Amino acid sequence: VLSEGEWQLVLHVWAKVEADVAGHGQDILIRLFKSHPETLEKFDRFKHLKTEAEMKASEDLKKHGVTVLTALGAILKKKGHHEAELKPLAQSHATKHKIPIKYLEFISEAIIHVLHSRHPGDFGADAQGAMNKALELFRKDIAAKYKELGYQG
Numbered sequence: 739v740l741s742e743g744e745w746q747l748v749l750h751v752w753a754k755v756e757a758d759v760a761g762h763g764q765d766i767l768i769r770l771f772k773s774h775p776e777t778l779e780k781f782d783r784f785k786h787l788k789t790e791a792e793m794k795a796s797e798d799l800k801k802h803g804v805t806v807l808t809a810l811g812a813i814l815k816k817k818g819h820h821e822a823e824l825k826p827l828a829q830s831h832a833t834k835h836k837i838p839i840k841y842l843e844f845i846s847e848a849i850i851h852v853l854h855s856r857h858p859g860d861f862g863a864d865a866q867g868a869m870n871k872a873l874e875l876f877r878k879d880i881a882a883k884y885k886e887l888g889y890q891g
């Protein structure tokens with residue numbers, strides 16, 4: 739359970755993201771795909787991209803980055819009271835997209851890295867710890883829905 743102080747730290751940096759959702763989403767997906775190439779293989783939509791320059795030039799990848807970060811922002815802004823938002827996301831990622839929980843750890847690391855790069859003055863250690871806790875809460879709650887459905891592994 740995050741404290742109100744931890745949520746404020748999370749949402750203070752998140753408000754900076756919402757100034758350039760698309761640039762953040764590109765940086766985060768690209769870092770994900772470079773750091774963990776097995777993730778790229780889950781996107782039939784993107785698996786033709788073989789270089790970081792190709793990734794940066796894909797408007798379709800930039801669109802998906804906005805989709806991802808818009809869904810994550812709506813979850814974060816519920817401060818934990820996010821059951822309605824997670825249900826559908828867990829269900830599609832477990833049963834349709836077939837995304838292991840570990841890959842949600844990987845994209846959480848990429849989000850934290852990108853926020854540190856773009857917002858260092860609002861992403862000191864206190865805020866990095868709080869965002870780590872927020873993303874852990876996201877993964878914990880998704881993992882409980884995966885387990886229900888027979889996908890926690």
Ligand code: HEM
Binds near residue numbers: 781805806830831
């Ligand atoms: C912060 C974590 C994430 C969020 C908030 C998120 C959100 C979304 C949303 C909102 C959609 C479209 C609606 C739906 O299908 O449910 C989507 C699609 C999808 N996501 Fe995620 N996602 C996350 C992480 C991941 C990761 C780590 C992967 C793969 C490694 C992945 C793979 C996919 C795939 C394959 C699609 C369908 C893309 C397509 O072909 O259109 N997601 N995601």
